[PDB]
Design a protein around this nucleic acid. Structure first.
Ligand SMILES: Nc1nc2c(ncn2[C@H]2C[C@H](O)[C@@H](COP(=O)(O)OP(=O)(O)[C@@H](Cl)P(=O)(O)O)O2)c(=O)[nH]1
Ligand SMILES: [Cl-]
Ligand SMILES: [Cl-]
Ligand SMILES: [Cl-]
Ligand SMILES: [Cl-]
Ligand SMILES: [Cl-]
Ligand SMILES: [Mg+2]
Ligand code: NA
Ligand code: NA
Ligand code: NA
Length: 326
DNA sequence: CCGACCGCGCATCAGC
DNA sequence: GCTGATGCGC
DNA sequence: GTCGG
């Protein structure tokens, strides 16, 4: 919150670019600047000071000067007053509606929650569930609830096959006191980079969690990735918990460290780390770290026995998950 | 000045 | 059906 | 929008 006004402004600008302008690189540029400014340990006194930080250039520096002088930004004030920009921005808040669908809906005269609810037949499955839990999905999850959810997921997974390992990642693993959703990394000895010896490894787990009425809805589901909706059980006479987003990712057991690095994030941290990898001549995904050849072709997976080995390859000092919240 | 900007799973669609 | 491109979200 | 080279 030290430079909260500035970071909020950059984030609003980032969202505009992504949702309305459909300019993903401007979106990332603003997110990068917000992130660097968020961790800067001084109250920013000028745009020039800000411009010293990597990711902050001339245009953002001017915006910071305007914001510091006036408490606001004219570019944003106008954006807020633009009905078409306002409408697209709102619609993209529904899970499943992105920039393209949002602008398409607006073209068709569909621009409010009421419009969505009366045109439910124009929504795909993902969009329908996003609309249904629109309110719920914007509520954060207290770590206490995350702990209860972890306990259910771990125990239920254990009931299916004691050889499964489920790990809660995302901001939870980075020690955050609240989370937007739950991310679960899943392994089982049967599924490795070499072989898949049992079918339905993910399916069985999803099934059990639906069976106990923990998972309530499915957004998408394939052999290795589940994205859906869950809900803690409530007690007698007590109000129901909000429905929550849950993602489950089944990763080859021998590829756990790359997978846990990936699912812990943050997403900006992963982008930064992967970009650094490239500068050092490596490429990182959720499975492997590979050297890049003298032309640019990914080579063979390098041996990895800890998250820190991955840091070591790219000559970064190790950062604990708590220090990855960029 | 100017490409390059992380990397990928699932749903959905166009074209054959 | 299939492949491949796009959207969306992670 | 920013940056490296
Ligand atoms: N490489 C990469 N990894 C990503 C990206 N987006 C997400 N991930 C990885 C890293 C993310 O950490 C992880 C989960 O994605 P959530 O969006 O749930 O992000 P968080 O859990 O961090 C928090 Cl926003 P919280 O949900 O508690 O509010 O997936 C991406 O664009 N690129
Ligand atoms: Cl762009
Ligand atoms: Cl403003
Ligand atoms: Cl690994
Ligand atoms: Cl790989
Ligand atoms: Cl930590
Ligand atoms: Mg999360
Ligand atoms: Na700078
Ligand atoms: Na959306
Ligand atoms: Na998630």
């Amino acid at each position: 919150t030290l430079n909260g006004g500035i970071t909020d402004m950059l984030t609003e600008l980032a969202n505009f670019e992504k949702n309305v302008s459909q300019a993903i690189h401007k979106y990332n540029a603003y997110r990068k600047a917000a992130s660097v400014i968020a961790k800067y340990p001084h109250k920013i006194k000028s745009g020039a000071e800000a411009k010293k930080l990597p990711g902050v250039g001339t245009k953002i520096a001017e915006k910071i000067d305007e914001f510091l002088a006036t408490g606001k930004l004219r570019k944003l004030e106008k954006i807020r007053q633009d009905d078409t920009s306002s409408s697209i921005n709102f619609l993209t808040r529904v899970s499943g509606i992105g920039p393209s669908a949002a602008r398409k809906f607006v073209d068709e005269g569909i621009k409010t929650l009421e419009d969505l609810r009366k045109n439910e037949d124009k929504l795909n499955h993902h969009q329908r569930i996003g609309l249904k839990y629109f309110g719920d999905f914007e509520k954060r999850i207290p770590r206490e609830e995350m702990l209860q959810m972890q306990d259910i997921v771990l125990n239920e997974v254990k009931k299916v096959d004691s050889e499964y390992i489920a790990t809660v990642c995302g901001s939870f693993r980075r020690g955050a006191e609240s989370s937007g959703d739950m991310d679960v990394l899943l392994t089982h000895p049967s599924f490795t980079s070499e072989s898949t010896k049992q079918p339905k490894l993910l399916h069985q787990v999803v099934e059990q969690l639906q069976k106990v009425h923990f998972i309530t809805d499915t957004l998408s589901k394939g052999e290795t990735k589940f994205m859906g909706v869950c809900q803690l059980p409530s007690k007698n006479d007590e109000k129901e918990y909000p429905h929550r987003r849950i993602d489950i990712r089944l990763i080859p057991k021998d590829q756990y460290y790359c997978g846990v690095l990936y699912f812990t994030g943050s997403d900006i941290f992963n982008k930064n780390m992967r970009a650094h990898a490239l500068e050092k001549g490596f490429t990182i995904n959720e499975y492997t770290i590979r050297p890049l050849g003298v032309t640019g072709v990914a080579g063979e997976p390098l041996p990895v026995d800890s998250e820190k080995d991955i840091f070591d390859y790219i000559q970064w000092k190790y950062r604990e998950p708590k220090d990855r919240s960029e």
